[PDB]
Design a binder for this molecule. Sequence first.
Ligand SMILES: CC(C)(COP(=O)(O)OP(=O)(O)OC[C@H]1O[C@@H](n2cnc3c(N)ncnc32)[C@H](O)[C@@H]1OP(=O)(O)O)[C@@H](O)C(=O)NCCC(=O)NCCS
Ligand code: NA
Length: 273
Amino acid sequence: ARVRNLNRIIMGKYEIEPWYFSPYPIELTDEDFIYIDDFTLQYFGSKKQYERYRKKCTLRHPPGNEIYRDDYVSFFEIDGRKQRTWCRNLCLLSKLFLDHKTLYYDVDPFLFYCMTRRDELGHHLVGYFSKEKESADGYNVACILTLPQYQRMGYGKLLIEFSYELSKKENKVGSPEKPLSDLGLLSYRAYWSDTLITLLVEHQKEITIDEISSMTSMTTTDILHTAKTLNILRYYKGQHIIFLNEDILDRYNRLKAKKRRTIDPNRLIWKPP
Ligand SMILES: CC(C)(COP(=O)(O)OP(=O)(O)OC[C@H]1O[C@@H](n2cnc3c(N)ncnc32)[C@H](O)[C@@H]1OP(=O)(O)O)[C@@H](O)C(=O)NCCC(=O)NCCS
Ligand code: NA
């Protein structure tokens, strides 16, 4: 009698192996897989069951308001309390790739911003980031995730950039919840670096900390840490600034050479509560 662990999830054409254990309320059997509907995120122990529900009539995108939509991606804002089932399913899926995550069942305190890529086939959920409706620490991101099958395609940086656009619209600085996984922290460091580098080349050769946080919603701490890492911190005109140098120009051009997609602030149709 085999009592197997969940060793693989079948999502669309993808067969993904979890990185960590997730509390799916499922029976342990001699099989080690479950089906995850790429639209509803519902889990099924049998292909037959999955098929049975797949036929049902359902929207083909996350259950929320589309507050951002460009030719590349869309962002749906979902209130956990309004979509408990879907969000709980999202959290169970997310935990498979997180060392730790708050109780998956309690989604009420969060707002989920799910990003989809649109094809000739429609919407495809590629990642998301949750956010406390009320954060005592002012965290502008609780958890963030790019589904495994879509990682290392630039989606994570888009998720992060979007979280800062919300903060900017809110007239507040923000920073991701600590502690961050290594993957998460390294992604933020790259984003913060790319951001200061782009500002120095496209905005001004010299910029004060205040100006930076005002334009990016990045906190003083994240700005200083990033500036020190790049060796671009100085004192000019009576205050601390970051400055441009050949290294930064080089980095900027290399960044641009990759012709990466970015978020257009003008397409964010959203008002904070
Ligand atoms: C952290 C996380 C969101 C990052 O998401 P992601 O989608 O992989 O992020 P990005 O793709 O924007 O990261 C940039 C990387 O992708 C690579 N990349 C992006 N587009 C690419 C392309 N078209 N071709 C080749 N490489 C590409 C970049 O070269 C870069 O590699 P590097 O970091 O070694 O320099 C993701 O690793 C994840 O969900 N991890 C598990 C959950 C987790 O730990 N979350 C954070 C909790 S604190
Ligand atoms: Na996180």
